[PDB]
Ligand binder design. Structure first.
Ligand SMILES: *[C@@H]1O[C@H](CO)[C@@H](O[C@@H]2O[C@H](CO)[C@@H](O[C@@H]3O[C@H](CO)[C@@H](O)[C@H](O)[C@@H]3O)[C@H](O)[C@H]2NC(C)=O)[C@H](O)[C@H]1NC(C)=O
Ligand SMILES: *[C@@H]1O[C@H](CO)[C@@H](O[C@@H]2O[C@H](CO)[C@@H](O[C@@H]3O[C@H](CO)[C@@H](O)[C@H](O)[C@@H]3O)[C@H](O)[C@H]2NC(C)=O)[C@H](O)[C@H]1NC(C)=O
Ligand SMILES: *[C@@H]1O[C@H](CO)[C@@H](O[C@@H]2O[C@H](CO)[C@@H](O)[C@H](O)[C@H]2NC(C)=O)[C@H](O)[C@H]1NC(C)=O
Lengths: 36, 501
């Protein structure tokens, strides 16, 4: 539920959850629509 | 003066694709010598060229170099990291993970990095990092932070060259004589109160010198420790007011200068405004707002036109928040000026379990009816399909765009269900592009004469993929007959930009 519009992947060295967003989203939790 | 940029505050967030992120970085630090904020280098890949970074001489905030896979990052002339803002509450320089196997971030030839005024450093997991394990950080970092130093150097690639023998104690930033570490602090004399040029007491640097000097006077510093005049380093800028001891009265100083970053300037540049403490800020944001007094911008206390100043999403009590919420909305009650940015996202109307945020009741958007000024940008990527216009911002008058969305857009109406914009009171968009796209029912957007609202030359408009002009013409949804060729925010006479109500 963390990544709103993306796949979640954990960096254990950073101890941080990184969201890899989908086709037309961006942001930390993939909560922003990409602005062209 | 030097060429300046603002930097970034994105941390380990990526923008778009690798090419998009690289385009943003390159377009932000192009020919930048003074980074007023933070220098963030993330997600630089493969054989991407970063030789435009060789112009950077000083960074005020922090420098976060992480998640890259490029073999070289040429911060060759980055002299000082002032560390006025930390990363993760500790470090002013953070070289975190930068491996793909063992290839990537091999050469970090920061030959002239000699001063870290505040904060500590963190090197964590860089298998290809080559010659940074040899650097003595006692010379660069202040002693007060030497306890928080988290240095890690376990090299898997093991292809790194050896330092030049001319480098003292084998300390080199990279291979070669030019890449020898220059010690300007721990190789001084007991008489030197700061940096030095050599071991003898005749080589002490001025107290206002940071990261070394070329002579003994205060006009010979490599970079000033506090404030820089035209050529002289100073502990403070020439005050705007001076105490008169004969009349016992503060008089106006004819040679006073405001504080622009780390320089003393006779006038705050554009998109900046003086304060009551003689410092240029990007925008007034505490209990003040922008005013035109003496023909110059000043931060005046909230009185008269201003009724209440409130923080935007991202800073203040709204920091680490993503948009306006069922719990955010209440605190926006009766605010007239927003000190920062405004975000409206679909997660606001769908709710978020991760933050225990229930859906936002649409009617509560009416709280924003008192907002008449936004210092940053206005981003609307979600709106009640039930509503037909942006009636919440009916009385919004000006968007300054001091902070812009991705460094570009000060207004962003995207993928809404509105038929008109309804920004009847909007009269000025000071700086920043305007993008209006995906609003498949919006009509009158292209009628507006946006040049009449822009204040800065070069502002662009990206108004595309809404509703067709002929589609609105064949429906009567056009600007009112009482309107002017300047356009309209809707079908009513009160929506005209000129000859309005
Ligand atoms: C909707 O609005 C609310 C209220 O503004 C947002 O709640 C805020 O959520 C953040 C998320 O972390 C909280 O930040 C804090 O950060 C520190 C350091 O990471 C951590 O130790 C705290 O436990 C907390 O996580 C913030 O306190 C919180 N504010 C509240 C509850 O008043 C919410 O995030 C917004 N919803 C979305 C989707 O953004
Ligand atoms: C997203 O926006 C569209 C466009 O405004 C909304 O469609 C509109 O919905 C209203 C009803 O709330 C329609 O009004 C109705 O029109 C009929 C004539 O067709 C009339 O007899 C009714 O008394 C009522 O006035 C309006 O025509 C319609 N717009 C169209 C079809 O272009 C839509 O409802 C919005 N999305 C959601 C989920 O509500
Ligand atoms: C970064 O700045 C350089 C110049 O400092 C830009 O290079 C110019 O780019 C345009 C685009 O085609 C060319 O027509 C010019 O001939 C280029 N050279 C010069 C000297 O102007 C570059 O485009 C800038 N990049 C970004 C992303 O802003």
């Amino acid at each position: 539920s963390y990544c709103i519009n993306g796949a979640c992947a954990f960096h254990h060295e950073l101890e941080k959850a990184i969201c890899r967003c989908f086709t037309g989203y961006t942001g930390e939790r993939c909560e922003h629509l990409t602005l062209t | 003066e030097k060429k300046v940029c603002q930097g970034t505050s994105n941390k380990l967030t990526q923008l778009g694709t690798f090419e998009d992120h690289f385009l943003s970085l390159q377009r932000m630090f192009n020919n930048c010598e003074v980074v007023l904020g933070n220098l963030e280098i993330t997600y630089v890949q493969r054989n991407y060229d970063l030789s435009f970074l060789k112009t950077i001489q000083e960074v005020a905030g922090y420098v976060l170099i992480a998640l890259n896979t490029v073999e070289r990052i040429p911060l060759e002339n980055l002299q000082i990291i002032r560390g006025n803002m930390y990363y993760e509450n500790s470090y002013a320089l953070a070289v975190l993970s930068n491996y793909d196997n063992k290839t990537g971030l091999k050469e970090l030839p920061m030959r002239n990095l000699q001063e870290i005024l505040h904060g500590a450093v963190r090197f964590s997991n860089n298998p290809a990092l080559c010659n940074v394990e040899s650097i003595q950080w006692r010379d660069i970092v202040s002693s007060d932070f030497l306890s928080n130093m988290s240095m890690d150097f376990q090299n898997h690639l093991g292809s790194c060259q050896k330092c030049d023998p001319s480098c003292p104690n084998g300390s080199c930033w990279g291979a070669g004589e030019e890449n020898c570490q220059k010690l300007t602090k721990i190789i001084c004399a007991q008489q030197c109160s700061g940096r030095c040029r050599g071991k003898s007491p005749s080589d002490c640097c001025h107290n206002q010198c940071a990261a070394g000097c070329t002579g003994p006077r205060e006009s010979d510093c490599l970079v000033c420790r506090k404030f820089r005049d035209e050529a002289t380093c100073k502990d403070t800028c020439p005050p705007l007011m001076l105490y008169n001891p004969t009349t016992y009265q503060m008089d106006v100083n004819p040679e006073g200068k405001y504080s622009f970053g780390a320089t003393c300037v006779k006038k705050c540049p554009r998109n900046y405004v003086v304060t009551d403490h003689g410092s240029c800020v990007r925008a007034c944001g505490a209990d003040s707002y922008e005013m035109e007094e003496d023909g110059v911008r000043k931060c005046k206390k909230c009185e008269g036109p201003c009724r209440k100043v409130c923080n935007g999403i991202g800073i203040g009590e709204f920091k680490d928040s993503l948009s306006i919420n069922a719990t955010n909305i209440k605190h926006f009650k009766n605010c007239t000026s927003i000190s920062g940015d405004l975000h409206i996202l679909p997660v606001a109307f769908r709710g978020d379990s991760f933050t225990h945020t229930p859906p936002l009741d649409p009617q509560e958007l009416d709280i924003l009816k008192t907002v008449k000024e936004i210092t940053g940008f206005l981003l609307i990527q979600a709106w009640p399909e039930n509503r037909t216009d942006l009636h919440a911002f009916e009385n919004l008058e000006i968007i300054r765009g001091r902070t812009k969305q991705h460094g570009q857009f000060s207004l962003a109406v995207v993928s809404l269900n509105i038929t008109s914009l309804g920004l009847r009171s909007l009269k000025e968009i000071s700086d920043g592009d305007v993008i209006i796209s995906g609003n498949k029912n919006l009509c009158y957007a292209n009628t507006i004469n946006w040049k009449k609202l822009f204040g800065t030359s070069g502002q662009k408009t990206k108004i595309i993929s809404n509703r067709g002009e002929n589609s609105c013409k064949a429906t009567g949804q056009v600007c009112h007959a009482l309107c002017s060729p300047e356009g309209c925010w809707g079908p009513e006479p009160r929506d005209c930009v000129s000859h309005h109500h």
